[PDB]
Amino acid sequence: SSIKKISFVGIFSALATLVMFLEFPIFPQASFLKYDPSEIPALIVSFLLGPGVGMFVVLVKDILFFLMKSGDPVGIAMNAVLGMSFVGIAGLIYHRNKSRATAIKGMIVATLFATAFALGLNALIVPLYFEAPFELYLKFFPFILAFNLVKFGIDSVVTFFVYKKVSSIL
Ligand SMILES: Cc1cc2nc3c(=O)[nH]c(=O)nc-3n(C[C@H](O)[C@H](O)[C@H](O)CO)c2cc1C
């Protein structure tokens, strides 16, 4: 039944939006970087149903969060762009031969791409957002690499240990 999958997707974008209110800065200096575990639900959906569906969960969840927090379109756009890359790369790698090996490799390749991708965009957004010299991005660089690494690392480890316990329940 597709309605069982629509239910699953609709449920998991609702939890992805709720859990986002738990955001907090891991680094008090780079306080604009806030961690939230909202992509663990999307990565589960990506793994159990397809990369495109998991990315769709990230977009629905961030749209809903922006309407409730309209004060930050820049900081939600970057979360949306990175979350869909991370959960997209991981699911595409993994679905070519569903196993833990390509689940593990899917999340590592996705984590390192999203982090480099973050560094490239965080290189272009930080000076504009703070109306500051490129100096400041280089000052933020060690926090940016460390943060998007811990964020998508913990999201990978958590997802890895939970998402087949989720396939059993279905
Ligand atoms: C300037 C700016 C840069 C951000 N950079 C990253 C990033 O590089 N990697 C990431 O995972 N999240 C990043 N975020 C995600 C951030 O936690 C999210 O957008 C929050 O809603 C910002 O308050 C960034 C946010 C902002 C505002």
Q: Give, using CA atoms, the residue closest to atom 20 of ligand 1.
A: 75
Whether 67 contacts 50, CB under 8 Å? no
Q: Tokens standing for 66?
A: 């922006």
Provide CB contacts within 8 A for 156, sequence distance 6+: 43, 90, 107, 108, 110, 111
| Domains by residue range for the chain, with CATH | 1-170 (1.10.1760.20)
Q: Distance (Å, rounded) from C-alpha 6 to C-alpha 99?
A: 24
Q: Distance (Å, rounded) from C-alpha 82 to C-alpha 94?
A: 18
Tell how far the Cα of 117 is from the centroid of ligand 1, in angstroms.
Answer: 12
Experimental method: X-ray
Ligand 1 pocket, CB under 6 A = 32-34, 72, 74-76, 78-79, 82, 118, 122, 125-126, 129, 144, 148, 151
Q: Which phi and psi (to 5°) does residue 99 adopt?
A: -160, 170
Tell how far the Cα of 49 is from the centroid of ligand 1, in angstroms.
Answer: 27
Tell how far the Cα of 12 is from the centroid of ligand 1, in angstroms.
Answer: 22
Q: Give, using CA atoms, the residue closest to atom 10 of ligand 1.
A: 148
Cα dist from 145 to 58, 91, 102, 129, 169, whole Å: 21, 23, 24, 18, 36
Tell how far the Cα of 144 is from the centroid of ligand 1, in angstroms.
Answer: 9
Q: Distance (Å, rounded) from C-alpha 110 to C-alpha 73?
A: 24
Identity of the amino acid at 51? P
Q: Tokens standing for 49?
A: 């149903």
